[PDB]
Structures are given as C-alpha cells and as structure tokens.
C-alpha cells in the first residue's frame, strides 16, 4: 500500500482505526498532542471499505499507552496486522480484529509513544512506533 | 511582559526578530520544521514599535544553528536581552542590537535547538532553548 | 528468580548466555561499552547447570544489534524466555533454545540497545531493554 510517516510529537490524544473481524486492520488516523495542543495527523485510509471503526480518545495527559500488541498474519498472501490492542495506564482498548497468527507486543516500562509510521493498502501492511521520554 | 512557549519541534527553518541599536531586542517569531513540514509558531511581539526586523531563513536541513550568544543588560531598570547572534554551520548571523553588558553564549558541540520559550514586553525579557538530538 | 538491572551504558560489545534445547534460557552476562571502554556487567547466573553457553562478541562500534526476538513459554509452570535471537547489521546470532510458544520481537528501526534488566531463577524469567540514541 501507500507508506505514511506522521513523524514525532509530544504525545497522543486519540487513535481512530478500522478493523474487520474476518480480514485485518484497515485505515488509521492519529490525533497527537503538539506542545499542549491537539494535532490531528493525516488520515491513512484503506483502499477498500467494509470495516468497523474504533475511536480511542485518551484522557491526555493523565492517560497514556503503556503497551501495544496484536497479531500479524497473511490475508490473501499479504502479511498484514490483523489485530490490535492498546493498553493504557487506565484501561485496555481491544483487541480489535482477528487474533490469529504471529503475536507481537511492545510493553513500555518507561517512555512514551510519540509517533506512528507505516504502510496501508487494503489493510494495515506494517507499522513502526516513535519512542521518547 | 507576556510569556510564551513554542514547545519542541524537529528543527528550525527560520527566525525573525526585532532589534534596536539603542535599546534592546524586540519581538520574535520562529518558523520550525515539524517532521519535514514548515511550522510557523505564533508571533511574539513587542508592546512597542520602532525596531528593525531581521529575517534569518536557514538552509534546512543542511544548515543548523551551532551557537547562540548575546548580551544581557538593563534598559530602564528592566533586565533584557539587548543583543543576539546566531551562528550556524554555514555562517554567522549578527550580532544585532546593543553589545553592552553581560555576555552569554550557548555553543553546541552536539545536538540541536528545537524550540524557544520566554517572555517579551517592551523588549525580550529573557528566553530559554529546547535542546535535543 | 533474582532480579537484576545493569542500567544504561553507551553500547554493547559482547553478550554471553546459556540455553538448553529442551528447557529454556539460562544465565546472562553482558559486556557493554562505557564511553569507549569495555565494561563487563555482573554475571546473572541460573540457579542450576546443564546449559550450553553462547558467546556473541559484537564488532563494536561498526556492528550493533538491530533486532532481538525469541519465544516465551512455560517450563514446569514457570513462564520463561525459551529462545533468543540477536540480529545485528552484520549477521544473525541464533536462534538458541526452544522455539515453541509465544513469539516476541523487538526490531529497531532507529536507536540502540544500551542496557538489560530482568530476572533469572532456574531460567531467564523475563527481561527488559534500555533504548537510546
């Protein structure tokens, strides 16, 4: 799919994304915090439709993500993220999607997620996370 | 004067500010780089006029500031920044203003300036610098 | 087991650890780089013996770890690291151990591992990684 790179910010206020219980993760749009102000990054959309959107609006700054995990798996030959789970210091959001295949997890002992980059086609192909104090 | 805090960014593209050869530094407006895009921060203006504006547009990203220096001094009882000089890896910009009083200097051996905060009234009262790799 | 925390350093020169093809990972001892000099951290040993030791001596500083992965699994009711693989920008070291159970992976796009902390009893119970530019 088309690659994207939101770059780095000062935190995260909200994360909206698509998921399909049969296929995999779809589009993603993150609203970061930029020096105290909301900063909605560009919407990274799926090439297709038929998803369910989930909107995680974090209670910034008292609430932050302490772990991101999910499942990687092939869908029609494509290796994509099929499930996602966002755990914060207040609650867990997810899992959303198909929890089958290879699991992955990024627990954070100290530090903060401050950005996302990746690639999305029909589904979320892969993604990376910016970390910082 | 009124305090301001631009916060942190990914670099600096341009710095515009006022100076008066008799008094001190006036308003300041910085254009940062935010993940590859220009991001003009808010204009922090002087309460008064009668200044000369200087516009330093850096050749980002090949060009970056390697040292900031100047003079601190009293103007009508107020301790303010009276002179500023921005040295980059390509050239020196300044000094602009009154070079009398207590000198200060922030040479940077490794790292980058990624933000400015401070206070401006009739003149620039004081300021701080965000540093980061 | 007994917890350990090497803290942070300026890089990694060598990593020695035990593994058993039937059970799981055993002891671990890291030799870091501290401002250009070798710094052998304390040996975090298993409570038992019967392992095979592997010594990964990285070609510092031109060679560094770009990903750490492995498998988590229960061994006699204990959830422990059963397999480890260290991939550098020069080659892959591993996997060493039992590759069964839940996989985990820490690919690093940018940054460096500069420390290890965790807990070891009969086997490596769990561990964390210090990251830094």
């Amino acid at each position: 799919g088309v690659t994207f790179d939101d770059g780095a910010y000062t935190g995260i206020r909200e994360i909206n994304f698509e998921y399909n219980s049969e296929t995999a993760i779809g589009g993603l749009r993150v609203t970061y915090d930029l020096n105290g102000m909301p900063f909605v990054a560009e919407d990274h959309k799926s090439f297709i439709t038929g998803f369910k959107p989930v909107k995680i609006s974090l209670e910034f700054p008292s609430e932050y993500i302490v772990e991101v995990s999910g499942y990687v798996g092939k869908v029609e030959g494509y290796t994509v993220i099929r499930s996602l789970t966002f755990k914060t210091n207040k609650q867990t959001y997810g899992p959303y999607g198909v929890t089958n295949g290879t699991p992955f997890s990024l627990p954070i002992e100290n530090g903060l997620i401050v950005g996302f980059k990746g690639s999305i086609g029909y589904w979320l192909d892969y993604f990376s996370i910016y970390l910082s104090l | 004067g009124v305090t301001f805090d631009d916060g942190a960014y990914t670099g600096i593209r341009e710095i515009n500010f006022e100076y008066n050869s008799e008094t001190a530094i006036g308003g300041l407006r910085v254009t940062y780089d935010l993940n590859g895009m220009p991001f003009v921060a808010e204009d922090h203006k002087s309460f008064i006029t009668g200044f000369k504006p200087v516009k330093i547009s850096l050749e980002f990203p090949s060009e970056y500031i390697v040292e900031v220096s100047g003079y601190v001094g009293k103007v009508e009882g107020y301790t303010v920044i009276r002179s500023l000089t921005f040295k980059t890896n390509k050239q020196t910009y300044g000094p602009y203003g009154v070079t009398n009083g207590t000198p200060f200097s922030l040479p940077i051996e490794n790292g980058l300036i990624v933000g400015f905060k401070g206070s401006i009234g009739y003149w620039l009262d004081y300021f701080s610098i965000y540093l980061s790799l | 087991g007994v917890t350990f925390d090497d803290g942070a350093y300026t890089g990694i020169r060598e990593i020695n650890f035990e593994y058993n093809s039937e059970t799981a990972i055993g002891g671990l001892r890291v030799t870091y780089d501290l401002n250009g000099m070798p710094f052998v951290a304390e040996d975090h040993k298993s409570f038992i013996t019967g392992f095979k030791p592997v010594k990964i001596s990285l070609e510092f500083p031109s060679e560094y770890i770009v990903e750490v992965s492995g498998y988590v699994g229960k061994v006699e009711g204990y959830t422990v690291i059963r397999s480890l693989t260290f991939k550098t920008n020069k080659q892959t070291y591993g996997p060493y151990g039992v590759t069964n159970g839940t996989p985990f992976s820490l690919p690093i796009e940018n940054g460096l591992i500069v420390g290890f902390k965790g807990s070891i009893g009969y086997w490596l119970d769990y561990f964390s990684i210090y990251l830094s530019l």
């Binding site: 979320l124 892969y126 910082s132 | 780089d33 990203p61 | 796009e109 830094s132």
Partner: peptide
C-alpha cells in the same frame, strides 16, 4: 550525515 533534522528512537516495524 550530521544535519539539522532532530533524530528519534523508532521501534518496529511489525507486520513484515
């Protein structure tokens, strides 16, 4: 190398 672009710690990607 050695430019004015702030560097960041990036982990991943996952999904390859």
């Amino acid at each position: 190398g050695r430019n004015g672009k702030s560097q960041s710690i990036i982990v991943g990607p996952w999904g390859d």
